[PDB]
Structure formats: structure tokens, C-alpha cells
């Protein structure tokens, strides 16, 4: 009886402690994720081509629409095992914690995402994504990032504009994770490898055939 109550005591402390760290995510309101869709270069992922949405997708989350905002094998994975935030978890650190990192902010950041994925589908979440992640260059929207680096637009029913291509959509997927350093107006032999790997993953996953892989690879290498 000497081992269950300090086996209690550390189990009930533990839990206080997630508890309490549940009432500090309590808020951060999810709410406030709709602001989002104000920017004068907000596009839902709905609007944009499936190879451009899958850019992102295999490269940052590529069970996005399977799990509940916790990617298991990715954060077992992310235990340090040779990462590992689901796309969920990325749109709650980059709308509220744009400042912090710490263990504790990292638990509280769960309990919001399970909030985002009750309250927000899929697409919503996505497209919360894709509209407030930094490409560079002050760009915080895909759009807004297809616009300045390449004067192409990601919205496929768009006509003033010429579309997006497959090897662009790679590089902004690419650029979102990378080193600071990865300069997509002069892109380092690092960050060539980083995007072929991002195409390779688009092709494995079945987000683009061959032809266009191949053409994207080779328009990567003039
Ligand atoms: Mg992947
Ligand atoms: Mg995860």
C-alpha cells in the first residue's frame, strides 16, 4: 500500500497538470480562425487545382483527411526516431502561438487542434492553412506567395491569370518547412532537392502522373 498511493499521487499530479493545461488552451478561441477568410488573397482549397492542394498535403500531412488533428505515426515518429505536426496542428501555432514554443504551449496547442477539427471540416482547414503560412518575402496566402514569385494564380477557375504550375506548387509546399535560408528567388541546390523530393511524393501519392512529374523535374533543372 506504499506504492499506490505515490503511483496515485504522481498520477493524480499529472493529471491535474493536463487539466489545468486544458483551461490554458481554453482560449484561444477557434472562432477566431474565420478572420482567415478576410485577407484580400484568401482562396479556399476548394477553388484550387488537386495537384496544388497535394503539394502540401504529401509533403506536410500526407493523412491529412484520415486523422482528428493528432497524426500518431507522425508524432511517434516526431519523438525524435529518424515532423511531426499534422496540417491541424500547423494552422493552430500559426494563428495563436506566432510567438511561442515551449512543452507546455505544445500541449495546450492539442487540445486546440481537437477543437479546430470538431468545429471546422477538412477543406475549411486546409484552406486556413494555405492562407496564413509564410512563403517569404512577407507572403502569408498561397495566393499571395503564386502572385509575387511566379505571377501565376492557384485559383483554378481563375481566367485574368495563368495558372499555377505543378513545379510551383512543389516549391511553396516545399519552402513552408524549410530552413529560413531557402530562397525561392535563388534556390540553393538544398532547396532543388527538397522540391524534387516534394514531386517525388506527389507522384508516389498519385497527386500527378508521370508526365507532369517529369516535366516539373526537368522545368527544375534550366
Ligand atoms: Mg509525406
Ligand atoms: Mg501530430
Known sequence: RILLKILLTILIIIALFIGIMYFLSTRDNVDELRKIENKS???????????????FISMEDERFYNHH?????????ALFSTGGSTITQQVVKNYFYDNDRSFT?????????????KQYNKNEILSFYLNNIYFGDNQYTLEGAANHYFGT?????????????????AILASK???????????????????????????KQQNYINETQYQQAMSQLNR
Open 176 to 202: 513552408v518547412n524549410a530552413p529560413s535560408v531557402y530562397n525561392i528567388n535563388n534556390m540553393s541546390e538544398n532547396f532543388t532537392q527538397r522540391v524534387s523530393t516534394n514531386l517525388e511524393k506527389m
Open 153 to 169: 494564380t492557384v485559383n483554378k477557375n481563375s481566367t485574368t491569370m495563368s495558372h499555377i504550375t505543378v513545379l510551383q506548387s
Open 69 to 77: 488533428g493528432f497524426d500518431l505515426k507522425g508524432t511517434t515518429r
Open 41 to 55: 488573397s484568401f482562396v479556399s482549397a476548394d477553388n484550387m487545382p488537386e495537384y496544388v492542394k497535394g503539394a
Open 105 to 117: 504551449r505544445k500541449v495546450k496547442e492539442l487540445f486546440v487542434a481537437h477543437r479546430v477539427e
